Design a protein around this ligand. Structure first.
Ligand SMILES: Nc1nc2c(ncn2[C@@H]2O[C@H](COP(=O)(O)OP(=O)(O)OP(=O)(O)O)[C@@H](O)[C@H]2O)c(=O)[nH]1
Ligand SMILES: [Mg+2]
Ligand code: NA
Lengths: 19, 995, 121, 209
């Protein structure tokens, strides 16, 4: 529902950046 | 110095032998090598056995005596029946005498087991020859002799153990069928006497070393003896009680009870069922009180590796799995056996936690057998709910990567059954493990990878709605885990595992287009990441998702302007900019998979040309430059670009097959032009620089271009649906570009991929191009055979592809062999027989298959002058070359195919399918049938090849072989009996009447 | 190697020329390291085989040495070594070292030349 | 210096000698020269528990070149049985090799090795390799060619013979090497030997390294 949209939002921010 | 012993003129210097032997075993460097060559030439001396009783009497060196018995063994097994009968009695008496001598001396019996066990093995070689026909009293006297001395009784158990092994376990290869039956029947005739002594010793329990030896012999008896000796005596109580308490006897006892669990047993006897339950109850009871309780950490015990603990735990696993696989149903109905059932399974759970790959595979086979049963057999799961729950955690915590195919397949299968049996428990264990990654309790690169592979494995077992909530929970938790961690190293590992799990859940991806699109756009972002492994992970995941979800990329999704394939193709330059060529080829292959789903022809061809835009514009540029100046092609950068264009075409062709035609048509003409230009450049470099040129980067680069062109054409033709276009458009230009170039290059400049390519061409369209097939033979046959007919090693790739080519030509276009000049047809027969003599199994198998198919091709011709001339020229060449490799001991891998070919050749004559006499005018009487002449030719051939065989052996072998030539398995038996008899002198000719 | 600094570390396969047999023989596959001694400031090649960790190259990057191409490779260097102590006492070898790529090979030879003119001092 | 006798047995062509040569010098021998009788090669490993030396008796698989056969097994402390995963017959003969081996050596650690796993067309599948279970053999998939698990038979036997399950291979500290001090007398000699080297192609140039 909205929680499938929350998955899409969160998946978009997935990144590999050195910290 | 040492080479004195090799001089047989004089009496043997024992002290000299003992230094030669001693500087071999305890020596070093050049001295021990010199002694080694001396000792080898000594024992290989055919008269060496005469000087054997000397060494056993006068030598004090145990190694000298060992080697003396080896010399004897070689005589007994090979030349025994050639000896005068008083030599046979002599040898028997001083082997028996040496054994009782060493048993009577406790010092020698303790300290020289190697020499005693070797003496026993030598005695058993004599029994195989002489017992029981010329030694009826051996067993009665062995049984009576055992009462006199414990040491003699112990050694007698070792003799009986070896006798059982040699007759029942190792007879199949090493004896004729007849001799095997005779020795089996003799052992079972007198086994009653032997068992009584066995059981007597075990009950009286004199000495542990004697008891271990009796139980070792019993383990061998259990492979063949009838079940009544185990069930109608007290022996099950002894094995399962007193012998499980002592650690000396426990190792061997457990192995015995494992083989008891395998006995052939009547399945309808309530008393026998109770006996089967009882020995299990007794065994498990002794484990619990004497070894370790159900709760013991077997993982820690096994890891510590004290004494024989690892072997014991290996044997307990084998015992429980064997027994429960066969008998667990006996324990499932009675409430009093419930605790026994679950304790035995609780031991297996503890065994399943040991860090030992090969032990885990053993327990995993059992778990598979169990959970397979709980999934189908009614009213059984509730029994095992606590076992299965523990097992879920054991499989998950020990999950391996899919790269380990077998273990991963076995693990997935079990975990899928355990998910069907309790979805809720599986989900809880996997979510809890995930929480222990997030809080850092169990956090590790290995631990998150393991969990990812496990969560990935159970895809498609849950309902779609349960899977939806599970997948979302796992992805969100893994995404949070990635955010929480620091450093490219940590975030890359978690991002890979996120991407791994998503790829394993296609049903979820198909149902949620917005998510699938996000996943793919994220893979496109990762294709710009330089961190080690990310681009490979992104490309591997991309083609994996596409293989499963292709339909969702080729249709227009309701909220989208176009099919997503079109979007992928627009940004293909930008998306693949940072990938290595191999990664770009995977990407293009993935797009080819999607484009094959488009069933509108106009639309498929439009997407295909859209996808091939970049390689097609690089191509148009490079042919213009390459046609204008042939020098520009010699540049490395141009060779790499061209090779990468052709490889892009191979990649897309691999996934599109028949649908790739329009793209192949677009490049075909200029590609075959390029193939010729590149061919010339290669030949020109071989001319200026020599053969060493073929190893230079730039020539290897040029040859890659040729190989990738041949790969592209092979790949298309292999999958082509429109064979008329293959023949009328592809083939003639292909044959003109590759065949002459191959023929006229020096051997080291010839590409074996030409032969491979031609094999496929003949396979798919051989029937339609008979003149093309002849052109292929003329071009590659004689010059390839010359490369490979000097030894068995040089041009290995050409060798293998050569015989695949002849195989397919002999199947699809035999006509091409009828058109060969006789001289060249003779070379064809030489080339098949050449294949026979290979060890390389790819060549050997094709060799025998061509021979068999050729014989059948000639059969089909009927009574025609060519079939008649073939049989008169080549029939006996094929029989005698097949017999050569059957009997030479160097081609045992091809026995089945050799046997089949020989049977086919012999059956031709015994069905009168050969119309001409096989014999020369006035070589035999005028009337004589081929049957009679085959018998004479074979008799004479085997007589010369094996002169130590009698005329009676050869005649009997051949009467059996020829009458058995419609029954392959029996034929094979006769061939195996013949292979045993050529190894010895005085083989019984009656042995060939077994069948 | 607790008092030495890593200047360069690359994965490589090392070969030795058997002049008698007239062929190249693999000597080891592993991390080839350029180690600068804290005391002498002398840079050596130390190469250990994967898994066994046995030494298959141990010599000074001498300023005399010259990296030549091999006829068969775009990602290898050949050079005479007058004193390698991998397998006992200082012995002379004709080495070849092959890398994963042409750029690994080029970065090696540039790093090998840096080390030669550290060994000049 | 702990010293152990290792017998290496199995069918001709399985890669027993190639395997030993790989451990001795690091070379991979492409050519097949059948062993005659036995070849003894001393082999040393460096571990946390100190150096371990194997006297490796590399026996002949072929019957005609068999020589002393079971004579080579006398006083062996450990063994490797070798078969070829590409050759079904080599696995079928494993019980024969084990039988001959255990008769001479009753109580020794034994590793079963499937060689040539680098080859794509694997005839002897993982699922059918079960002989080791009842005989308490350690089993390893190995490749003398790719070095896949090439160290594991020796690590396993080392752990069994020394009786330490935590034993591991270690790097020995590397001695500072000497200065060249090249002599002009041999200048011409090296010039020539280096030209032959440069103009002989490195083997296996399509391999990853
Ligand atoms: N592909 C491949 N070939 C191998 C491998 N190991 C050995 N070979 C080849 O196998 C052949 C036989 O190797 P050897 O070591 O001589 O065989 P062996 O077992 O010693 O033979 P015998 O001395 O007759 O017992 C040679 O051509 C080797 O190069 C391997 O891991 N992979
Ligand atoms: Mg050998
Ligand atoms: Na998985």
């Amino acid at each position: 529902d909205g929680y499938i949209e929350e998955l899409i939002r969160m998946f978009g921010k997935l990144s590999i950046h050195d910290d | 110095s040492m080479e004195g012993i090799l001089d047989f003129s004089n009496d043997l210097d024992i002290a000299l032998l003992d230094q030669v032997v001693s500087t071999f075993y305890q020596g070093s460097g050049v001295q021990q090598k010199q002694a080694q060559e001396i000792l080898t030439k000594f024992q290989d001396n055919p008269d060496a056995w005469q000087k054997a009783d000397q060494i056993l009497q006068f030598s004090t060196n145990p190694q000298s005596k060992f080697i003396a018995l080896s010399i004897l063994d070689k005589l007994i097994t090979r030349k025994w029946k050639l000896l005068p009968n008083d030599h046979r009695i002599g040898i028997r008496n001083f082997v028996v005498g040496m054994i009782i001598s060493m048993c009577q001396d406790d010092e020698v019996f303790k300290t020289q087991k190697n020499l005693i066990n070797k003496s026993d093995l030598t005695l058993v070689q004599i029994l195989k020859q002489e017992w029981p026909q010329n030694w009826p009293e051996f067993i009665p006297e062995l049984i009576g002799s055992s009462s006199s001395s414990v040491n003699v009784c112990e050694n007698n158990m070792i003799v009986l153990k070896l006798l059982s092994e040699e007759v029942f376990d190792f007879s199949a290869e090493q004896m004729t069928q007849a001799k095997a039956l005779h020795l089996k029947n003799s052992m079972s005739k007198e086994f009653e006497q032997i068992f009584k002594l066995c059981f007597q010793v075990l009950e009286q329990g004199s000495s542990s070393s004697l008891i271990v030896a009796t139980l070792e012999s019993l383990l061998r008896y259990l492979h063949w003896i009838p079940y009544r000796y185990i069930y109608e005596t007290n022996i099950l109580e002894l094995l399962s009680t007193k012998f499980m308490t002592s650690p000396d006897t426990r190792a061997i006892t457990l192995k015995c009870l494992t083989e008891v669990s395998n006995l052939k047993i009547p399945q309808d006897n309530d008393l026998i069922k109770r006996q089967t339950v009882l020995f299990f109850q007794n065994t498990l009871q002794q484990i619990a009180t004497s070894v370790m309780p159900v709760t013991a950490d077997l993982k820690a015990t096994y890891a510590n590796a004290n004494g024989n603990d690892q072997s014991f735990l290996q044997d307990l696993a084998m015992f429980l799995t064997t027994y429960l696989a066969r008998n667990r149903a006996l324990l499932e109905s009675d409430e009093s056996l419930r605790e026994l059932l679950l304790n035995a399974h609780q031991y297996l759970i503890q065994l399943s936690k040991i860090e030992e790959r090969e032990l885990f595979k053993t327990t995993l086979d059992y778990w598979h057998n169990l959970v397979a049963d709980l999934f189908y057999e009614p009213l059984k799961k509730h029994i095992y709910e606590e076992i299965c729950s523990q097992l879920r955690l054991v499989i998950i915590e020990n999950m391996v990567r899919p790269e380990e195919i077998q273990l991963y397949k076995s693990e997935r299968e079990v975990l899928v059954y355990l998910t069907h049996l309790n979805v809720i428990d599986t989900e809880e264990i996997m979510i809890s493990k995930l929480a222990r990654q997030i809080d850092g309790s169990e956090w590790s690169w290995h631990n998150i990878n393991t969990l990812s592979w496990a969560i990935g494995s159970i895809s498609g077992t849950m309902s779609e709605d349960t899977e939806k909530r599970f997948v979302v929970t796992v992805i969100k938790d893994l995404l949070g885990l990635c955010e929480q961690k620091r450093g490219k190293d940590n975030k890359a590992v978690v991002a890979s595992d996120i991407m791994y799990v998503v790829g394993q859940y296609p049903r979820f991806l198909k149902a949620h287009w917005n998510f699938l699109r996000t996943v793919i756009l994220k893979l496109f972002e990762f294709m710009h990441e330089t961190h080690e492994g990310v681009q490979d992970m992104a490309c591997d995941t991309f083609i994996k998702i596409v293989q499963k979800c292709k339909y969702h990329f080729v249709i227009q999704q309701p909220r989208e302007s176009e099919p997503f394939i079109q979007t992928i193709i627009r940004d293909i330059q930008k998306t693949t900019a940072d990938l290595q060529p191999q990664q770009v080829h995977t990407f293009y292959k993935a797009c080819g998979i999607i484009i094959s789903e488009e069933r509108s022809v106009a639309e498929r061809n439009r997407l295909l040309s859209d996808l091939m835009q970049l390689p097609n514009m690089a191509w148009d540029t490079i042919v213009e430059q390459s046609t204008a100046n042939p020098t520009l092609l010699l540049d490395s950068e141009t060779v790499k670009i061209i090779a990468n264009i052709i490889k892009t075409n191979v990649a897309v062709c691999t996934s599109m097959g028949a649908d790739f035609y329009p793209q192949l048509g677009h490049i075909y003409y200029n590609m075959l032009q390029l193939y010729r230009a590149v061919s010339s450049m290669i030949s020109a470099q071989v001319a200026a620089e020599g053969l060493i040129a073929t190893k230079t980067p730039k020539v290897r680069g040029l040859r890659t271009i040729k190989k990738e062109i041949l790969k592209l054409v092979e790949t298309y033709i292999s999958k082509a649906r429109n064979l008329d276009d293959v023949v009328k458009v592809l083939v003639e230009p292909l044959l003109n570009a590759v065949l002459e170039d191959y023929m006229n290059n020096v051997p080291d400049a010839r590409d074996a991929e030409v032969l491979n390519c031609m094999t496929t061409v003949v396979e798919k369209v051989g029937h339609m191009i008979p003149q093309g097939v002849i052109l292929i033979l003329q071009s590659v046959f004689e010059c390839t055979l010359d490369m490979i007919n000097k030894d068995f090693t040089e041009y290995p790739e050409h060798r293998v592809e050569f015989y695949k080519l002849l195989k397919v030509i002999n199947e699809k276009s035999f006509a091409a062999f009828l058109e060969l000049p006789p001289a060249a047809f003779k070379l064809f027969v030489d080339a098949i027989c050449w294949a026979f003599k290979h060890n390389n199994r790819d060549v050997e198998v094709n060799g025998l298959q061509i021979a068999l198919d050729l014989v059948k091709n000639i059969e089909r011709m009927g009574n025609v002058p060519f079939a008649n001339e073939f049989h008169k020229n080549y029939f006996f060449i094929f029989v005698s070359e097949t017999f050569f490799v059957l009997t030479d001991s160097d081609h045992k891998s091809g026995f089945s195919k050799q046997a089949l070919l020989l049977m086919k050749l012999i059956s031709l004559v015994y069905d009168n399918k050969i119309s001409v006499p096989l014999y020369q005018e006035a070589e035999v009487p005028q009337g004589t049938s081929n049957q009679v002449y085959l018998s004479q030719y074979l008799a004479n051939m085997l007589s010369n090849a094996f002169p130590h065989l009698t005329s009676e052996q050869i005649a009997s072998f051949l009467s059996a072989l020829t009458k058995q030539c419609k029954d392959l398995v029996v034929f094979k038996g006769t061939l195996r009996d013949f292979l045993v008899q050529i190894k010895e002198v005085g083989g019984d000719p009656t042995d060939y009447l077994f069948a | 190697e607790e008092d030495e600094e890593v200047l360069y570390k690359v994965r490589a396969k090392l070969f030795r020329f058997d002049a008698d047999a007239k062929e190249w023989k693999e000597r080891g596959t592993g991390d080839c390291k350029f180690l600068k001694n804290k005391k002498t400031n002398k840079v050596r090649i130390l190469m250990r085989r994967d898994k066994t960790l046995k030494i298959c190259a141990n010599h000074i990057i001498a300023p005399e040495y010259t990296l030549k191409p091999n006829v068969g490779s775009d990602r290898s260097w050949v050079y005479a070594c007058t004193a390698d102590i991998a397998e006992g006492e200082a012995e002379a070898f004709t080495f070849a070292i092959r890398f994963g790529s042409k750029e690994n090979a080029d970065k090696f030879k540039e790093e090998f030349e840096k080390a030669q003119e550290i060994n000049k001092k | 210096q702990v010293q152990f006798k290792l017998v290496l047995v199995g069918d001709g062509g399985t890669g027993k000698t190639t395997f030993v040569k790989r451990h001795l010098t690091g070379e991979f021998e492409k050519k097949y020269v059948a062993t005659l009788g036995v070849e003894v090669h001393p082999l040393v490993f460096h571990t946390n528990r100190g150096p371990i030396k194997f006297n490796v008796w590399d026996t002949a698989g072929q019957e005609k070149f068999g020589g002393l056969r079971d004579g080579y097994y006398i006083q062996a402390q450990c063994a490797i049985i070798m078969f070829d995963v590409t050759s079904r017959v080599t696995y079928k003969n494993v019980p024969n090799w084990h039988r001959d081996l255990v008769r001479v050596c009753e109580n020794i650690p034994i590793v079963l090795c499937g060689n040539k796993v680098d080859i794509k067309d694997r005839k002897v599948k993982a699922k059918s390799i079960v002989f080791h279970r009842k005989k308490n053999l350690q089993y390893y998939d190995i490749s003398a060619k790719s070095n896949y698990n090439f160290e594991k038979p020796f690590l396993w036997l080392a752990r069994k013979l020394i009786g330490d399950p935590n034993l591991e291979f270690v790097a020995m500290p590397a001695l500072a090497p000497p200065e060249v001090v090249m002599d002009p007398a041999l200048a011409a000699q090296y010039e020539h030997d280096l030209e032959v080297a440069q103009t002989t192609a490195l083997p296996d140039e399509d391999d990853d390294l």
